[PDB]
From Swiss-Prot, chains A, B:
Its EC number is 3.1.2.-, 3.5.1.-, 3.5.1.124. The lineage of its organism: Eukaryota, Metazoa, Chordata, Craniata, Vertebrata. A lipid is attached at C44, C51, C104 (S-palmitoyl cysteine). This is Parkinson disease protein 7. The gene is PARK7. One of its GO terms (cellular component) is mitochondrial intermembrane space. Changing E16N: Strongly decreases enzymatic activity. Induction: By hydrogen peroxide and UV irradiation. In pancreatic islets, expression increases under hyperglycemic conditions. Expression is also induced by sulforaphane, an isothiocyanate obtained from cruciferous vegetables. Homodimer. Binds EFCAB6/DJBP and PIAS2. Part of a ternary complex containing PARK7, EFCAB6/DJBP and AR. Interacts (via N-terminus) with OTUD7B. Interacts with BBS1, HIPK1, CLCF1 and MTERF. Forms a complex with PINK1 and PRKN. Interacts (via C-terminus) with NCF1; the interaction is enhanced by LPS and modulates NCF1 phosphorylation and membrane translocation. Interacts with NENF. It is linked to Parkinson disease 7: A neurodegenerative disorder characterized by resting tremor, postural tremor, bradykinesia, muscular rigidity, anxiety and psychotic episodes. PARK7 has onset before 40 years, slow progression and initial good response to levodopa. Some patients may show traits reminiscent of amyotrophic lateral sclerosis-parkinsonism/dementia complex (Guam disease). It is a lipid-anchor. It comes from Homo sapiens (Human).
Amino acid sequence: SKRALVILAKGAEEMETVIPVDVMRRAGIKVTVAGLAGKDPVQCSRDVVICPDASLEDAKKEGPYDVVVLPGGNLGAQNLSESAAVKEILKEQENRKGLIAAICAGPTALLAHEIGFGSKVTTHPLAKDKMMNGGHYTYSENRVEKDGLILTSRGPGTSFEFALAIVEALNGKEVAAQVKAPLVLK
Amino acid sequence: SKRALVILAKGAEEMETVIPVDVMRRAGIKVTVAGLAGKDPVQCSRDVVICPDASLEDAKKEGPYDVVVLPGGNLGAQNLSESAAVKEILKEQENRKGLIAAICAGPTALLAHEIGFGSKVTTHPLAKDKMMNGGHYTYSENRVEKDGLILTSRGPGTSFEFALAIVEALNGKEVAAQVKAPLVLK
């Protein structure tokens, strides 16, 4: 009954894609993995090939979504940053006061599309300078940062924390705790 | 220059599949994701669809491998446990004194194929009783267990530790440390 849209572009970090999709489905969220380029399989940064559930064009017609999720991976985030379709989805989600979650270089697509300026954010350490160009955000080193409806995180190793923060935001702390225990997190 | 074979069956835990593949490729290992059933895309436990690099039939002809990796997921591990092809690959890897790595319900395929008896092993907590049927192994609660050439781990949340243990076994501690830092692990 909550719904998530995960936007999958060539060059996405596959761990940052699969960990949130899997954890959100464990939480009972209806997740649509949507291909930026169309319905065809997507070659991720480390050459894992993932078949999306739908094209982004089709998935948009089925919104709105409770969260829009942007994986990282530098080339994936670049492709999200260059997409007019992504711009329109994020602007509409911002406008309706829905959650936007981005991990690793993913938040640099928020910069590109002028989303969430004035928010505290984090990114992978190597993406800090790009994200901070112009001083439009306030930078954090927290592993997960949530400033209202903009949720960001740092890297593959923060992907479980990121996904469980999404789950808590949508489904509450009790569901997040229930989902977390079987994962054998430290 | 080291080589890994990852055997991907329907119902595999996608996080336990993708995290080791990605981390091992970061370490410079040549990884073949081989489909148990053939060359076609594989529907994982949480409905992520992954396109393998090759069928297992083809990938075997290209061995030997420095490690054979068995992801978890209960139905994935069941399919690995029922496969005569997997039996032959694991027996040959055992015989040549090559590493076998299995995570979560994955080690129950070792039981099925009578691999590594007498070793200390771990599994997901919910797979302990199945793994221990007959007392053929000695159970551990360590997050990663390595008893010589049998390497096991417990769940999605131990997948990074599992993958970095594989990297250390193949490529050494210095490479594992170099791969680990950009991941933003805690």
